[model samples]
Target chain A: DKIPDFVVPGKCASVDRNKLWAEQTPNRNSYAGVWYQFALTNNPYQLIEKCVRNEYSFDGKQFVIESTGIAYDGNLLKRNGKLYPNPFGEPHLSIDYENSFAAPLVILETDYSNYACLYSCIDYNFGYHSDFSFIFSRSANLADQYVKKCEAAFKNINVDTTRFVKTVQGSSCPYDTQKTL
Target chain B: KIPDFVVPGKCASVDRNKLWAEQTPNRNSYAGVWYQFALTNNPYQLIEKCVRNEYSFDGKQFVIESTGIAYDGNLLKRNGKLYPNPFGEPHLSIDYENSFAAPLVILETDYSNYACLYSCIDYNFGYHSDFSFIFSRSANLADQYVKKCEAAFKNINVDTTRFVKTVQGSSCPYDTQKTL
Candidate 1:
């Protein structure tokens, strides 16, 4: 059976990630990269804004994330416990050391070279759940074609892409390199 | 002297059995779709427009489960005022310290037609902002009821012109109609 659209992991089309990993995708040793956030779900009331830079790298086993943005806490930029893939297949898991909570992280769609569409959900067990989706680009600016592809991916997963607010990105941002932020 | 009596009391059902049996038919009961005929701002309009507000009362506090919003508030009546407690995150299952901090007061309601509500927030630094709403059982209200709801705001010295009409016709994708 498929997972529920919210509070549970939605289904994703099977892609040969092992083959792509050897060619284009971010692998174990060569995974450190920067991504520009394009859009995110507005539900659950978050302070994140567009053009936020997310620095990601693989810590041999887990994926570490450090984000810099204008809104919300800049102090939370430090490394949380990080995320790692599950044993059987897709829909990775994120465990926070300080907060002490776990969540399901799914890669809805991605080319690994150009863009990635990520979805995550946390169940509160109170008859309802909170879900989040993000559109990330390898470059600070993404082509319109890839943008539509990401939106379509979210719609395929029943994530309601229409409600997603755009993340601002362009030359106006000062931190364009690792030395800046 | 003009008294605060212009604002009617909460809607009460004449037949207790009918009130207890049916939830959607009663206007006071939060089951069916409630259209926002008028609101003060976009945030207020978007949250309430064609919303299926599901409410559960345990004889003490009223818990609201709405489609457009994530957080839930506990409302209790005291001296004709509806005081909202801190919001509880339905997803995290934790009651956060953050709250609206605004006292919600119902200006008028006929139980079968329309309800006018008002809330004001006052900061200690001598600044304040107030929000108002006119909710209707139907998507559009009768012209007479519109003027009557506006009159209630005028009586309280609120700017009735600032209240924008909400879109609730065919474009409204009400939660009750969805397959969720």
Candidate 2:
């Protein structure tokens, strides 16, 4: 019901063109899983401190994004995302939150395995820096080597590298035993 | 490198498999909650936290559900199948997704502990590095239980060194409990 910015030979104006959409099958498969947050630059949700992870599962129609973890405190956090299909089959996905567009979200780099880097930008009528970039990995730390690799990759993408803050990957925090509901 | 072990005599030195948990239980009481505190041979990392498994039974079948953390998200869930002790004892041979499973069991009152093993190597992916985690009914467990849980993996040949203990200071809901 919530289709995006275009139709067939009907119309293809603004296709969230800043980031390219994925062009292969394996890339799509790898996209379906949890990606650990590794590092970020002038990021969104910067105040979060522990248990940051993303769960990605693709339904036939849309890509479901479930982002959860502690938000600096023991508070429960959940930010859900939906990446709508671009009729053009272009690599870009018109993503939104709470049902409205939060600018344009794009898939930058994902071998679909080890790492994924995503970027998005929203142009507010009076604002300047609406661009937000994220770097994710299969492991929490980026293991040292990936730290060098993903950082450089973001530069080519034009992210403000000087502000890149490496997140603390060691806080397992504290979990409970469980009692349904 | 939090990986390895559990299937004692399955594949090569590389294919750590087989090492089922001993002393089991059945009936229906073993369900509810168990938190994982350790895993020795984790050939794969990104071991999710707030790790716990929940179960229930309705005369004919056993319903098992798991909730844990993910690199991208949290409160991950996986449904499981329970058989009637293919092992002869009350222990059931369980099969959940590659996410987690306890092919094994036990006891009473308000406090208890366990180490459920996990392994799956098929014709295509050939030999997945096996691993398992110890659990209890509480957030933090007694040292006596914690010590044995870690040592059990060592005895069965898994490494718990880099194991990142799961966090559960927050609340998460499982699909097993929901509305229309």
Tell me each candidate's i-RMS in Å. Answer: 14.6, 21.9
Model 2 TM-score?
A: 0.39
Compose the digit string of candidate 2's lDDT tens values, residues A34-107: 77777665542243455567677888666777766666555656666666553334355655333112234566
lDDT value, residue B57 of candidate 1: 44
* Isolated chain B TM-score per model: 0.59, 0.57
Candidate whose lDDT is highest:
1
Instruction: Note the Cα lDDT for every prediction shown.
Output: 0.52, 0.49
Question: Per-residue lDDT for B84-156 in model 1, tens only?
Answer: 2222211111111111123345566675778776655332223345667887888789988889889988877
lDDT of 2 by residue, B43-87 (tens): 233326666667677764567666665545644555655544322
What lDDT is reached at residue B146 by model 1? 86
Q: Estimate the TM-score of every prediction.
A: 0.40, 0.39
Q: Model 1's CAPRI class?
A: incorrect
